[PDB]
Structures are given as structure tokens and as C-alpha cells.
Amino acid sequence: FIKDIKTSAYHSRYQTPFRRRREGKTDYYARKRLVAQHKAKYNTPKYRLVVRFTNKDIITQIVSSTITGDIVLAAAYSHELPRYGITHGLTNWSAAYATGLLLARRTLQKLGLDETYPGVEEVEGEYELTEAVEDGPRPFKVYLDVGLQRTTTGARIFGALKGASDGGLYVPHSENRFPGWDFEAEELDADLLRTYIFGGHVSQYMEELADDDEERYRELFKGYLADDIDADAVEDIYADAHAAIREDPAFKPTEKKFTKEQYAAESKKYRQVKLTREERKARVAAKISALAPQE
Amino acid sequence: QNPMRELKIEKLVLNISVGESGDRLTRASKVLEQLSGQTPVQSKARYTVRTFGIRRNEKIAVHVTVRGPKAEEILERGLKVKEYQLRNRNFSATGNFGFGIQEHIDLGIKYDPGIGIYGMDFYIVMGRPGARVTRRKRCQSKIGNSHKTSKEDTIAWFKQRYDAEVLD
Amino acid sequence: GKSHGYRSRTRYMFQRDFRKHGAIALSTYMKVYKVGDIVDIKANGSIHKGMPHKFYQGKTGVVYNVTKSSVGIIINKMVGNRYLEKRLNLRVEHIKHSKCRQEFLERVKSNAAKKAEAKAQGVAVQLKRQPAQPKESRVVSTEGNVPQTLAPVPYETF
Amino acid sequence: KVLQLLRLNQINSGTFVKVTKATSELLKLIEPYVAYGYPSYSTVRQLV
RNA sequence: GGUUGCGGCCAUAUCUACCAGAAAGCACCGUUUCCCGUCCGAUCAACUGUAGUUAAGCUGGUAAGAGCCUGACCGAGUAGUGUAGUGGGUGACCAUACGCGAAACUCAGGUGCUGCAAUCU
RNA sequence: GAAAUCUCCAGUAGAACAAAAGGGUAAAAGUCCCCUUGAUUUUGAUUUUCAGUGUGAAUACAAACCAUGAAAGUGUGGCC
RNA sequence: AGGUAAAGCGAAUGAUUAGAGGUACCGGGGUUGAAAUGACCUUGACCUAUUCUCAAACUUUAAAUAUGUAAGAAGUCCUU
């Protein structure tokens, strides 16, 4: 007795979920709407801006879909920000804004829209979309993608939205999921939005723990105190980092070290190998011959 | 060897059931507010029974969730009433335990003539680090058999702490 | 009274499948349709909008118009003693490409290669398709292949 | 319909058929109504 | 070759029980000023990558495993069936002639492939 | 208390979806929470019963004007 | 493209004959010291592997015969 549900009949009549769903990655109910193109356009690719947030890293991609598999136009990473003068705090709001502005300028250099559609080179924290220039080509339209991530008012996913918008791309959006948005009286507080761009929310928390609890101020901010970084220096880091991105955003790969075959030679030492069918039946001969007289 | 498998109290859930509606319930709500500090949550009926005497969607029972350091105090408060002596029931196959008391006059508190007298149902779930595996949205999965909690292992933990016994 | 509804006698036709319920794969939506392509029709039980009538299950026709989510397909049907033209408007989820015309385009390219190649060498092409001809004469070797003498078996009760 | 294609409209009628796989399937349909076999350079000479 | 991000076909990819995993990555993991959301910072949101760990997840191997997938002169030219006779038989139904032809069953072998971009003794 | 409420484990749907019956659906078309009036306007094309007449219902667009969502989109009443 | 003939029930849905085992946590009648929080009986309670027979309004599987499309100048490619 008890239950005994998992029988031969249950396994035979079980429809497996695709695989991406079985892992817990993709939502196909959302992806049907995002990927599917208007059929009067035939073969115009529908670009979508992927944004993901792993532990201590941010990922950003621009993706086109085909029958064989998805093709990447261009991609950027938060661990490349060390080149532009940012070491600590790679999973902040300011990193997501910096990564978004980096991604846009990579793609616009390939397509050829550097001078035309520059973006916003002043930044007061305003709600704006990139306007089309008269007697010329329209801006590069990219739709925003989320995945299985939650959407709330003031989340890092919508920081990358404005990064791509301020970079030059026409990413259409509303004002109501940026930080400093009054819920009752629907208006934008531009002062509170500008602070999150230049690492303001973190630099205020520097001032509080500096005077108050010194144990937390040594536990947190080890790298800031080790590399000699004061509270008011945070404005100069993210301001100068934005200018460096608008200069040479080309992507250059690493030195790598060792060839692909040397990695393959090292990796195959530890990972195990299968047996032949004769060696399987040799183990059966051992189990029979050992347990025939019993020991 | 055992570094990560610490075995700890994850949460404590107090529950006070009643059989009627209205004013007696609202008194029992303020007992758990003094007990815990948090505002409790009110359950309600699934279907009409009649023999006990409650309709469907009548609204009757109350409960509250307790986590962290505040849960460990209220557990020992309840065990002080039970003389640190639980039976060999009071323990699931998965290794979660609980016990019943009558009257909230014990474990601190007072009579307070206006509010009245009520019993409780204590219940504690036990787990290990890596319970986020099941509870998170992105990438859900089952837990391996070595990491799962059992009855015998939880009783061995319970004898070590608290100065307590199994009796049966 | 007699029953003559829209989805009458459609118990097994619009029944989904064995172990293929739920969502559809994305390749169905990605496929392109220009005005001219031949397409076979298959109804899908899950998708209820732009669904074909039972008669057009397994029929084939040419595309005449394209729009947002659908394609216009003209199908010729028999009625009385005279064929009539009919216009349908089905969504992309039901339609798939036909593989009948597929083999014809392979034959056009191969014949063009054989005519162009052989004229500057062979002076003899033979490009019309031959029906399956009868046998030619041959000899069978009996070395290590001697005939086994058979005989009809007697009757037994299993 | 097949007898109409092979020009056997009247009772007792000849033709000759070039033997293929396709033409063999026509003869399967009409086998109760016709008798047929392989001629030689002798019967063909007399008929013509 | 290992791993991450977005995928295609959607079990050769699932399910159950026991062992193994260098490097990097992924994860668990540590905190609650600020946006945010709960009965509960568990979930979601923000913050640090610092205090810790391969225990789980994830990846791979093992098992005369259940299941799923190919094939066979394995069962079987058997069941069924289009066409024909002034064929048989009281009928029920059967055999022959020219053609087309299964499914269970039994045996044998396998147990995820692959596209774009990034990275690593 | 066999049956109230509370917690964990197994759970391919064996539940539920205003009614007859069949089909369909699992990060939903089921259950709960937030905002609203695409049950709106102007007219034609088209499937089903069919004389390829009408009646009823249903499907796919054009020009408008709105709702909702960060968006892609979805919506011209009730999953069919 | 199809769900009829046949096939199938140690494969869902529903129908159905016969024992064997596990008994165990358990619903019960006894016989044994009124005894049994104990045995052995018919036992259910299901469960576990087997076994006999079925289906217009059940089905994994799946013929024959009928049935849709194609086998080119209104064609296939190159250019602008």
C-alpha cells in the first residue's frame, strides 16, 4: 500500500516539457509574441535587447532569430568595465547604465550612425526618446527583453533600458518604472534619478557608516579604502568613465594564453569515459560467478 | 565530512483554530500580536460542513509566521510548558516537529479579563542551507537524498540542544 | 432534429496528438510565405482563431494574399457538376509548405546541367523520364548456392 | 475507361502494347474482360 | 574538450538509486541606509564580492534498471481486404484465381545531437 | 472526531473552466490581486447551410478613436 | 490528409474469472488465560507481481479500397 504512482504506465504516457522550460530558463508564452514578425515584412529581422543578472556580473546582448538558431549582432559585459576605469561595484545601478551605454555604441559603429544619432551628452535625468532626423535614416529600433526577472519601480533591468536609450538607440518605453517616480501624484523626480546614474545612492551610504558603525565600514568597502577612494570621488569615476566610452568602443579580445588544443588536452584527463558492450557483460559474468557459490 | 550541513530552525508557525465567527476570532488575533509582534493572517473555510457549524467562506482561523532569532525564544517558551519532554510522535518522516498547549496564560503574558483564554498549535520546519533551490523562480530543481532531512537525524539534534528527551 | 453545425463530426480530426499537447514550436511562426507558394492545410485543435472548416483538411492550394497573421489561399472544390473558386483566410499556425513541387525544381536544374554539359562532348542526352522497364537476360552462378528441394508440409493441430 | 484507352471498344479487337510497369497496371484492372500473351515474328506477319 | 548567455529539433534529451568533478564560470552563501514588496528581507527588491563552501543544484559515469528510439527472411505473406466464377455448402460460412498487405509478440543494437557570441591548466 | 484550520513530501492533470455532450488549455484558457469599457464608429470582402438566394453565426483586413502593459503585443464580447 | 476492417487490455477509460504473495498501519468477526495495543483462522483494506474473457457512442498502434496536389514557354535563372 501507500500510493505507488510511478509505474510502467505512468512513464510511457508522460509528455516531457521542451528542455529550456525543463531547465527553468525561457518563457515561451512571452517569446511567441516577441519573436513573431508581421508577415507583410517577410524577412526583416526583429532585434531584441537581452539583459541578464548573474552573481557579481551583468550581461547584455542584441539578438536576431532564425530557424537553425539565434544570431548575435553584438554583445557587451560588465567585467570589461575595468578598461574604462571602473573596478569595484560591477552589479550596481551605475554599472547597468554604463553597460547599456557601452552596448549601444558598439552596434551603432557597425551600422554607421556615430555622428547622426549621438544620444544625450549632458544628462539631467529626463524622460526622452530618440527623435528621427529629417532627410535621413531612422534610428536603430530594439525591443526590450526581460525573461524570468521581476519588473518593479526602480530595478536594475530598467537602468540598462535608459543606458541604451541615452546611448543612441530607439528603445520605446514609459516613465513609471524609473526610481524617483511618485506613485500617488504621477510625476518624475529628476533629482533622484540623476543620483543613481553617478553612484549617488552608494556614496550616501558611505557617509552614514563612516561616522556611525566602523566595523561595517571596514567589512564593506575594503577595496575602496585599500585603493584610496573617498566618498566624493565616486562622481568623478562614473563621469569620466562615460566620456571614455564615447571615444573608442570597439571590443578587443583578451590575450587568452595557450591554444584551444592545450585546453582540450588538460580537460580530458579528469572527465570519465564509457565502456564497450563486452566490458559490461564481463561485469555481469563477475556478479554471477561471485554470487553463484555466494562468496 | 560535514561543513555546510548545519541543520537549523527555518521558521515557526503559530496557529489558533476556532469554531464559530466574528468577535471571538478578533480577540484571538490580538493574542498572537502580543506574542509575535507582527499582524497575523486570517484563513477561511473551503466548504460547508454543518455538523461542526460553519459555512463556506465564513472566515474563522488565524495564524502567523515567525523567522530568525525571534523564533528560537518562542520555541523554548513553549518547551518550558511541556517540561522539555516531547513524545516519539510529534515528528514527521521529513523531520519537522510540533506540540499542542492549552491556555496562553503560560509562556509570559497574563489573564487580561477582556481578551479571554485560548490554546495554540506550535509547528517548526527544519532544513539546511540551499533551500533556495526549490523556492526561487529561475532554475527550480529537487534536492539530493544526502541533503534531505529525516526523523532520526532531527531527534538526535533535539537531544543535544535544549536539554530534552524523547520518552517513548 | 438533424444536427449540422460548424464543427460537426470533428472528434478525431481536431484532436491534438499523443504526447504533443500544449504550446507550438517557434519554427511554425518563422516560415515565410510569398504570393505564389503551394501549401497543404492541417487544423490545430489548440488554436481556435482563423480555423478551417472540416472539408479543407488535407486540401492543397496557392497563396494569393498576405497580411499580419494570416494568408489568403484559393481552393477549388467540386459541387453538383462544376468546379468553383473559393477564398479562405487562415492563420500561420495551420499552414505548412508542400513537398510536391519540391521535386520538380530539382529536375529543372539537373536537365539544364545535362544539356549544357553533354552538348560539348557526348552529342546525346536522353532527358525525358523513363518508366520502369522490364528485365534483361543474365546468368546465375550455382557455385556454393545449390537449390534446396522443398515440399508442402502436412496438416497438424498447432 | 481503360478499355476505351486501349482501343478495345468492340468485341474481338487487337492492338499491341509496349510492355512497361505503367502499362502492366492497366491490364490488371481489365483482366477479366481480355486474354493476352507474347506474340512472335509469324503471327504479327499474318495480322498486318 | 570544460563553462556561461540567447537558442533549434523537443525523452537517443525524461524518471529512480549509488559514486566522481583540476582550472575558470555557475551556484549556494553574507547585509537592510536608499527604490521596493510581504502576516514573515523565506520569495521579490536593493547592497558587498568582503566572512565562508563543493554539502546540494548544475555537469559526467555506473545499473543482465523501468521508459523512450531505430532495425530484422522474429512472428507473418498469417489477420484483413479490392476484383472474378452457372465454385462448394441446407444455411452459418468456407476454399481456389489475379493483386495489395498490418498490429501485438520475440531477438539485436543504442541512451541526446547541434547553431551564434563570450571565456578558461 | 472518517470530515474545520496549519506544515512538509509525492502528484501529466486522475481537478477546474455559467449549462448538454465532445474537443482544447499547466510560469494557463484554471485560482487570487491591480487598472478599465474592443459588448465602440464608418462601410465592404470571405467560410459554413447553399439555388453557391436570404436568415443566423463565424473568420481575415482598411481608415478612425480608446483600453492595458516597462514593452513586443493583445482586444470589434463570452476558450470552440 | 484520414481513424474504418483487423489489432490491443502484464497500455489509459470502463467491464471481468481464479488463486499466490506482502501482510500492517490497519476496518473488523471469532477460537485460545474475561485477557491482549498478542497468536492462528476465514478476512477485508488496498497494494505487489501474475492469469480467463470483452467494447456502435473506449484507445497506444493501424491496412486494403476510395481521395488532394505537382510532372514547365503563362517555364527556369541573369540584370537593372
Side-chain angles (χ1 to χ4, degrees):
Chain A
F1 56 82
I2 210 282
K3 169 194 80 192
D4 307 312
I5 196 162
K6 293 190 175 178
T7 57
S8 183
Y10 171 75
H11 298 297
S12 56
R13 303 178 58 76
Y14 183 81
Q15 184 184 320
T16 55
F18 280 20
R19 187 179 66 76
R20 227 78 179 96
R21 182 65 179 83
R22 182 153 38 75
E23 288 186 334
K25 260 57 173 294
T26 298
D27 190 298
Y28 288 107
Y29 183 79
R31 188 153 180 280
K32 279 171 150 187
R33 280 63 167 282
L34 191 61
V35 171
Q37 182 63 290
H38 191 274
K39 244 70 97 296
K41 302 164 193 172
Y42 300 91
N43 277 315
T44 56
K46 198 165 180 181
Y47 299 106
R48 60 194 181 82
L49 204 172
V50 178
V51 186
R52 302 293 131 118
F53 287 95
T54 62
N55 294 328
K56 50 187 166 189
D57 200 55
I58 310 168
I59 306 168
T60 52
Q61 301 181 324
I62 290 159
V63 180
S64 175
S65 301
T66 63
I67 298 166
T68 51
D70 290 16
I71 305 162
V72 178
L73 206 183
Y77 291 95
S78 57
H79 74 89
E80 300 177 6
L81 296 168
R83 297 214 183 195
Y84 301 90
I86 310 175
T87 53
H88 307 292
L90 308 180
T91 55
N92 321 346
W93 189 281
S94 193
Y97 182 90
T99 307
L101 195 137
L102 209 184
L103 210 208
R105 285 300 205 178
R106 294 271 188 76
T107 51
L108 295 168
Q109 200 167 61
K110 285 186 168 181
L111 299 172
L113 296 169
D114 300 324
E115 295 173 309
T116 52
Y117 302 88
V120 179
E121 309 188 53
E122 299 181 46
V123 184
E124 268 187 321
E126 302 170 36
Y127 170 69
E128 287 189 325
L129 302 173
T130 55
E131 300 184 322
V133 179
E134 295 188 326
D135 305 358
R138 287 176 289 176
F140 185 67
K141 195 199 294 182
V142 197
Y143 303 119
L144 193 71
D145 202 325
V146 183
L148 301 170
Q149 299 177 333
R150 195 63 133 277
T151 57
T152 57
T153 55
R156 289 177 291 164
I157 299 151
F158 303 115
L161 168 54
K162 182 155 174 155
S165 186
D166 292 23
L169 304 180
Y170 177 56
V171 186
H173 59 269
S174 187
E175 334 99 60
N176 67 302
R177 296 201 129 67
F178 295 117
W181 170 255
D182 192 284
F183 180 77
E184 298 184 322
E186 289 173 35
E187 291 187 320
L188 249 176
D189 296 32
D191 293 32
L192 300 179
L193 187 56
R194 206 213 309 177
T195 53
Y196 277 68
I197 298 163
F198 300 112
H201 73 278
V202 180
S203 65
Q204 288 177 27
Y205 193 50
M206 292 274 202
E207 294 173 21
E208 294 175 35
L209 293 180
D211 299 318
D212 295 34
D213 296 34
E214 279 277 25
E215 290 195 327
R216 295 193 194 179
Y217 199 73
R218 292 199 189 78
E219 286 160 35
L220 302 176
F221 313 109
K222 276 200 178 175
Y224 284 83
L225 296 170
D227 301 16
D228 301 40
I229 315 179
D230 297 26
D232 298 316
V234 172
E235 268 278 23
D236 295 37
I237 293 162
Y238 293 116
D240 294 34
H242 289 18
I245 294 160
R246 292 208 183 85
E247 199 171 39
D248 289 304
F251 179 73
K252 298 142 190 169
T254 56
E255 193 170 26
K256 303 180 178 174
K257 307 153 185 170
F258 317 118
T259 51
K260 295 267 279 187
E261 278 64 33
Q262 294 183 42
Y263 290 121
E266 183 59 33
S267 190
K268 288 177 180 187
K269 292 186 177 185
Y270 311 99
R271 189 148 138 281
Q272 298 175 229
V273 290
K274 298 183 182 183
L275 309 177
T276 57
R277 67 158 183 276
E278 295 162 34
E279 293 173 45
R280 291 172 179 175
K281 294 159 188 176
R283 292 171 161 281
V284 174
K287 289 175 185 180
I288 294 158
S289 63
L291 303 170
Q294 299 166 32
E295 198 185 342
Chain B
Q1 196 55 216
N2 317 315
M4 202 77 171
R5 56 172 76 266
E6 292 169 30
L7 190 55
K8 50 154 187 174
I9 295 163
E10 209 172 37
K11 57 164 185 180
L12 169 269
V13 179
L14 304 169
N15 185 45
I16 298 171
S17 302
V18 185
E20 54 165 277
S21 185
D23 194 50
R24 193 199 266 280
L25 178 270
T26 53
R27 292 159 160 179
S29 183
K30 291 192 289 186
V31 173
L32 295 167
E33 194 168 307
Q34 184 168 220
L35 204 301
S36 187
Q38 308 167 27
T39 312
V41 51
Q42 306 187 342
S43 184
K44 55 184 172 184
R46 304 187 202 284
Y47 55 93
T48 304
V49 188
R50 309 175 203 172
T51 54
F52 310 144
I54 49 170
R55 309 148 204 170
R56 66 155 284 165
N57 303 40
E58 185 163 303
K59 199 172 71 172
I60 185 50
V62 273
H63 63 276
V64 68
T65 51
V66 193
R67 293 184 193 271
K70 207 173 205 181
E72 196 179 359
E73 294 171 31
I74 296 161
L75 171 135
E76 294 177 309
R77 285 271 210 77
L79 293 164
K80 193 173 185 180
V81 174
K82 230 76 198 170
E83 313 189 332
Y84 295 81
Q85 281 184 315
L86 297 172
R87 302 171 84 269
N88 216 314
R89 299 179 184 173
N90 305 48
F91 276 115
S92 59
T94 57
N96 299 334
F97 63 95
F99 48 84
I101 75 172
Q102 306 102 246
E103 314 195 308
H104 71 81
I105 64 182
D106 301 69
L107 51 150
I109 344 189
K110 317 183 194 176
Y111 198 105
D112 297 347
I115 205 170
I117 305 295
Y118 298 103
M120 298 189 196
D121 286 282
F122 288 75
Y123 210 84
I124 311 85
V125 310
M126 299 296 292
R128 298 193 170 87
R132 188 167 199 280
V133 162
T134 50
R135 272 56 173 281
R136 72 174 175 261
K137 168 155 277 187
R138 180 154 141 72
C139 311
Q140 290 167 39
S141 56
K142 289 191 171 188
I143 322 182
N145 293 322
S146 58
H147 209 91
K148 296 186 192 182
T149 49
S150 58
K151 180 165 173 175
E152 178 270 343
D153 199 285
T154 312
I155 296 159
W157 178 85
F158 194 78
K159 285 210 186 70
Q160 189 178 37
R161 272 206 192 180
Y162 308 121
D163 191 45
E165 301 186 325
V166 78
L167 289 293
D168 297 26
Chain C
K2 296 289 187 182
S3 200
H4 299 303
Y6 205 92
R7 287 180 69 171
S8 185
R9 312 155 187 172
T10 63
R11 194 163 192 277
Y12 296 85
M13 294 172 62
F14 310 145
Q15 195 180 131
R16 194 69 161 76
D17 258 307
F18 190 58
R19 312 209 308 279
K20 302 187 174 293
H21 301 275
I24 314 173
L26 278 289
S27 58
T28 307
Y29 299 93
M30 291 294 300
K31 288 161 186 180
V32 193
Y33 297 101
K34 292 141 187 166
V35 176
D37 295 309
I38 300 165
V39 278
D40 293 43
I41 300 163
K42 277 193 80 176
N44 192 6
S46 57
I47 311 310
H48 299 300
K49 306 200 80 64
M51 195 175 183
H53 183 62
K54 67 195 188 186
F55 180 78
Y56 304 101
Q57 183 66 17
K59 264 60 176 176
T60 310
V62 184
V63 176
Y64 79 96
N65 186 31
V66 184
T67 185
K68 178 155 76 83
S69 60
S70 301
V71 289
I73 305 163
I74 81 299
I75 301 285
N76 290 308
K77 54 141 60 170
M78 162 52 193
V79 48
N81 57 317
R82 152 217 62 191
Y83 278 54
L84 294 180
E85 200 78 60
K86 293 210 154 287
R87 333 287 272 194
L88 276 57
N89 287 310
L90 302 168
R91 296 174 88 85
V92 69
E93 289 94 320
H94 313 299
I95 280 56
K96 57 184 282 168
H97 281 87
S98 190
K99 309 307 301 304
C100 58
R101 190 73 180 185
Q102 162 265 19
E103 80 95 59
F104 176 71
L105 279 298
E106 295 170 32
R107 189 147 52 79
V108 172
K109 285 183 162 59
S110 61
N111 292 348
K114 289 166 183 177
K115 198 195 177 188
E117 183 264 301
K119 71 171 281 184
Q121 180 263 314
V123 198
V125 305
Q126 206 285 130
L127 45 63
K128 297 199 187 192
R129 290 194 299 172
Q130 195 87 116
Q133 296 293 320
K135 299 178 186 284
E136 299 297 324
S137 57
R138 61 275 201 78
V139 177
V140 304
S141 186
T142 330
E143 192 171 38
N145 206 149
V146 186
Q148 298 165 29
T149 306
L150 307 181
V153 293
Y155 172 74
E156 331 87 325
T157 303
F158 53 80
Chain D
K1 179 56 173 167
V2 175
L3 291 161
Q4 218 164 234
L5 295 166
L6 302 181
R7 307 196 296 176
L8 308 182
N9 296 309
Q10 216 192 154
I11 195 175
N12 297 9
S13 297
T15 27
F16 298 124
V17 180
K18 178 166 147 287
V19 180
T20 59
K21 191 265 192 301
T23 53
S24 186
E25 305 310 314
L26 295 176
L27 298 173
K28 285 189 176 177
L29 282 161
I30 68 172
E31 68 182 310
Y33 313 117
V34 302
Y36 62 109
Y38 320 128
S40 58
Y41 182 62
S42 173
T43 310
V44 173
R45 187 160 180 281
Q46 290 184 346
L47 289 168
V48 178

